[PDB]
C-alpha cells in the first residue's frame, strides 16, 4: 500500500500519507483526526496521534512488506519518494487521496491557522489551491520525489475547486523520529 491509498477502521476511511521507518520498523503517517478515531486500522495498530493543534498520527504496519515508499498516482503508476522537504509559496504540488485520486495545484500560504469549529483549531498548516473531499485526509502532498505534507481539511470540492490545508510532514517525522521510505 502506497501514499494516497485507502486505510480504514470500522466504517471510517482516510488515506495513507507516507510509509516511514522508525529505527528500521515500518510505519505509516496519516492525519491525526483520523488516528484519533481508533487504535485498529486495516494496515495495523496506531502508535501515535496528535489532533487538534497538530494534524498527524502514525500506525505500525502488521505487514512490513506492505510499506511501499511511493505515492499512488491513480493511473496505474506511482511516484517514488526519496526525501521530505518544506513547502514554499508558489510551489507546484500534487496531492493523492482515496476519494478524488490525484490533483495538482500550488502552495498559496504557509503557517495558516485553521478553525474546524467543533473539531478544534490547527496551526501552522500549508495552504494550497488543490481541491480535496472527505476521505482524502491523511493523503500525500508532494512535489516529485519530495514529501511535503498530509491532507488535513479545507473548503469546497473537486468540481467547484476549493482551498486545502496540510500538516507539514517534517513536523510529524521529527515528532516520531521517523524517516520517509
Amino acid at each position: 500500500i502506497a501514499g494516497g491509498e485507502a486505510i480504514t477502521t470500522g466504517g471510517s476511511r482516510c488515506s495513507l500519507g507516507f510509509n516511514v521507518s522508525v529505527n528500521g520498523v515500518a510505519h505509516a503517517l496519516t492525519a491525526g483526526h483520523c488516528t484519533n478515531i481508533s487504535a485498529s486500522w486495516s494496515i495495523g495498530t496506531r502508535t501515535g496521534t496528535s489532533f487538534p493543534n497538530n494534524d498527524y498520527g502514525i500506525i505500525r504496519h502488521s505487514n512490513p512488506a506492505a510499506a511501499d515508499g511511493r505515492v499512488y498516482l491513480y493511473n496505474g503508476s506511482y511516484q517514488d519518494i526519496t526525501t521530505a522537504g518544506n513547502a514554499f509559496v508558489g510551489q507546484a504540488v500534487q496531492r493523492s487521496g482515496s476519494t478524488t485520486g490525484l490533483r495538482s495545484g500550488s502552495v498559496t500560504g504557509l503557517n495558516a491557522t485553521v478553525n474546524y469549529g467543533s473539531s478544534g483549531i490547527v496551526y501552522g498548516m500549508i495552504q494550497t489551491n488543490v481541491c480535496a473531499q472527505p476521505g482524502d485526509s491523511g493523503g500525500s502532498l508532494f512535489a516529485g520525489s519530495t514529501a511535503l505534507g498530509l491532507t488535513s481539511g479545507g473548503s469546497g470540492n473537486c468540481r467547484t475547486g476549493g482551498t486545502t490545508f496540510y500538516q507539514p510532514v517534517t513536523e510529524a517525522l521529527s515528532a516520531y523520529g521517523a524517516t520517509v521510505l
Binding site: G97, N115, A132, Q133, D136, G153, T163, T164
Partner: peptide, 4 residues
C-alpha cells in the same frame, strides 16, 4: 473549512 472542515476536516476531510
Amino acid at each position: 473549512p472542515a476536516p476531510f
